Structure formats: structure tokens, C-alpha cells
Paper text:
The SPO0826 gene of the marine α-proteobacterium Silicibacter pomeroyi encodes a protein with a molecular weight of 20.5 kDa (residues 1–­193) and a calculated isoelectric point of 6.2. The crystal structure of SPO0826 was determined to 2.1 Å resolution using the MAD method. The final model included one protomer (147 of 194 residues) and 42 water molecules in the asymmetric unit. No electron density was observed for residues from the expression and purification tag, SeMet1–Thr2, Gly103–Ala115, Lys137–His145 or Gly172–Arg193. SPO0826 also forms a single domain composed of seven β-strands (β1–β7; residues 4–17, 20–36, 78–85, 119–123, 130–134, 147–151 and 161–170), but with only two α-helices (H1 and H3; residues 48–69 and 91–97) and one 310-helix (H2; residues 73–75). The dis­ordered residues in the SPO0826 structure correspond to a large C-­terminal region of BB2672 that encompasses helix H4 (residues 97–109), most of the H4–β4 loop (residues 110–115), the β5–β6 loop (residues 137–145), including the 310-helix H5, and the C-terminal region (residues 172–193) after β7, including 310-helix H6. However, this interface was not observed in the SPO0826 structure, which crystallized with a single molecule in the asymmetric unit. In BB2672, the N-terminal interface is involved in the formation of the hexamer, while in SPO0826, it is only involved in crystal contacts. The observation that SPO0826 crystallizes as a monomer in high salt and acidic pH (2 M NaCl pH 6.5), while demonstrating the same hexameric oligomerization state in solution as BB2672 under alkaline and low-salt conditions (150 mM NaCl pH 8.0), lends further support to the hypothesis that pH or salt concentration might be a key factor in oligomerization.
Residue numbers in the entry: 3 to 102, 116 to 136, 146 to 171
Write the structure that this text describes.
């Protein structure tokens, strides 16, 4: 149930007043999905763990494709999830449970709020989408840095 996928890349060529050559780069891939447990009180979150496994792989691959690198060339990784208002924080936990240690963060939010994705070699990258996550959604992110 993926409504939107978004990929953000950032290249830094000058930092602390110093020319960074080659530029250092960060990428983050984000998916907006329907939370099957929105509006509900459930204990068995298997369905979100299985969905998270596939998303991590999908978003991790989008990151490396965006940076045009092989996965072994990545310096840092991280992942986060923001649950919409009719979900629970445990839903974000579940979605982040499977392995892609890699830092992760979970938050509750609303459309347009910024999610900070940690980067463990914490540093980080901010992501947002103007219209996500809606109350019945989850916004999941995977980030990778290069160089």
C-alpha cells in the first residue's frame, strides 16, 4: 500500500569554509504507506514487521541507486518512521524492527512535519513531505551517506 515514494540527495561542496572534493553526499528514500492498524488497538504487529522488511530493502536500494554507488561503498546508514495521528508509536517500532548497529528513531506526527533520520557510522538528515503522513499512514525513511 505505497501512496508516494520520495528520494532526497544532498551534496556538500563547501563546509566550514573549506572546498569538499570530492563532495560528500547523503541520500534518503521515503515511503508513505497506509497503516493497517490505524484506528485500531492490536497486539500482533507481524504484518507491519513483514512490510518493514520489504520497505527497508526497497528504500535502501533507492538510496544506493540515487547515489550511483554499490552498497559496500556506503559510509553510514540509518532509518526512521513517523506514524500518523490514528496510529501508535509501537507501529513505527514494528515497521523498523527487521534488520535492513544501524541507528533508528520513531515519532508520531502529522502531514508536513520534519522527521530526523539518524546516520550511524549521531549525524542526520531531515525529511518531510507536505502531505504525509496522514492520520491513517506511516512515513518510513532509510538514509545512506557516501564519502
Amino acid at each position: 500500500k505505497i501512496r508516494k515514494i520520495a528520494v532526497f540527495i544532498e551534496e556538500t561542496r563547501i563546509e566550514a569554509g573549506r572546498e569538499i572534493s570530492p563532495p560528500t553526499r547523503k541520500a534518503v528514500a521515503v515511503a508513505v504507506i497506509e497503516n493497517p492498524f490505524a484506528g485500531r488497538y492490536v497486539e500482533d504487529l507481524t504484518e507491519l514487521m513483514d512490510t518493514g522488511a520489504e520497505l527497508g530493502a526497497l528504500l535502501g536500494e533507492r538510496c544506493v541507486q540515487a547515489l550511483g554507488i554499490r552498497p559496500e561503498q556506503a559510509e553510514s546508514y540509518g532509518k526512521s518512521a513517523m506514524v500518523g495521528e490514528n496510529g501508535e508509536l509501537e507501529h513505527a517500532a514494528a515497521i523498523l524492527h527487521p534488520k535492513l548497529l544501524v541507528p533508528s528513531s520513531k515519532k508520531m506526527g502529522s502531514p508536513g512535519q520534519v522527521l530526523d533520520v539518524p546516520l550511524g557510522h549521531f549525524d542526520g538528515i531531515e525529511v518531510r513531505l507536505n502531505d504525509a503522513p496522514r492520520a491513517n499512514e506511516i512515513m518510513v525513511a532509510v538514509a545512506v551517506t557516501d564519502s
